Amino acid sequence: KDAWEIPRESLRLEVKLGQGCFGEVWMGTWNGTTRVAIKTLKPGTMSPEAFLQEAQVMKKLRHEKLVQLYAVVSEEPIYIVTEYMSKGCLLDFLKGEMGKYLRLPQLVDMAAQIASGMAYVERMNYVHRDLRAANILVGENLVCKVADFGLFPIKWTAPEAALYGRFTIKSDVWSFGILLTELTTKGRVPYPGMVNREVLDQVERGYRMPCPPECPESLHDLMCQCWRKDPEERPTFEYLQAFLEDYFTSTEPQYQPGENL
Numbered sequence: 001k002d003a004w005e006i007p008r009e010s011l012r013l014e015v016k017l018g019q020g021c022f023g024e025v026w027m028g029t030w031n032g033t034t035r036v037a038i039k040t041l042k043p044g045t046m047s048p049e050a051f052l053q054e055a056q057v058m059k060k061l062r063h064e065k066l067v068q069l070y071a072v073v074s075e076e077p078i079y080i081v082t083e084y085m086s087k088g089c090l091l092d093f094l095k096g097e098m099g100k101y102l103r104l105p106q107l108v109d110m111a112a113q114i115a116s117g118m119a120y121v122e123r124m125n126y127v128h129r130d131l132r133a134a135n136i137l138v139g140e141n142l143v144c145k146v147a148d149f150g151l152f153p154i155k156w157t158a159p160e161a162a163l164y165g166r167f168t169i170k171s172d173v174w175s176f177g178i179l180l181t182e183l184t185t186k187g188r189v190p191y192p193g194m195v196n197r198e199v200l201d202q203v204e205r206g207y208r209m210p211c212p213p214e215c216p217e218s219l220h221d222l223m224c225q226c227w228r229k230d231p232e233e234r235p236t237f238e239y240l241q242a243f244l245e246d247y248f249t250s251t252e253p254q255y256q257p258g259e260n261l
């Protein structure tokens, strides 16, 4: 009914990108010229108004470092259409062919951009709740955009969230820090060796991950401020961004290209 709507002759479903739970994800072309990502609803495997809740958010939330909602088709079969990202999600990108070649400069930059997005989310008074490498999209020239693929991620979750349901932007700052390890370890699931329950008692007993192999120390300090027990001591995203944008000038101007970072 609104300005976002387009005919289905414009939509060229070309290559599939996995069957979700309540539909499929598609790589394709809109208006025969624009590389596009299409999300499907399998009719009557979910409330229509539930499936369109997505686009209603993506309309509200617009920023260079966020997913772009392109277009909707809001009559069965229903199609949500969003800007295509050539590299797919960050997690894949990290532990795939390219991981080999990424260093701290490329990694902190990706991280800078995420913060940038997540900072707009701050200014929006919205919470994410599942910020983490699986939820970031990469495209050309290492562009990173915040997203949510619709995917119990306790390992990434702040204890006030995992425990008492107390979900804030500060609990998103906890995730960021975890994400900072995903980036510094090229994909490796945080708290290796630990089963969930184990993690949960452990960070309550105050345990944090060590600085990973060859990651500088000021990157870890930064991580730790994200993992402060008290939710309100954690840095603002505005802070984090700045910190990371200025990193190799203001913090590691003495940084030397390593074996893995």
Ligand SMILES: CC(C)(C)c1cc(NC(=O)Nc2ccc(Nc3ncnc4ccccc34)cc2)n(-c2cccc(N)c2)n1
Pocket: 017, 025, 037, 039, 053, 054, 055, 057, 058, 061, 066, 067, 082, 083, 084, 085, 086, 087, 088, 089, 128, 137, 146, 147, 148, 149, 150, 151
């Ligand atoms: C912005 C915020 C955080 C507010 C947001 C964003 C989304 N939704 C998405 O981000 N959806 C999404 C759309 C398309 C792809 N796939 C892809 N998109 C582009 N390129 C790809 C290249 C390869 C593979 C895939 C894709 C992945 C996720 N939110 C949301 C709200 C309510 C329910 C659900 N479930 C999500 N909230």
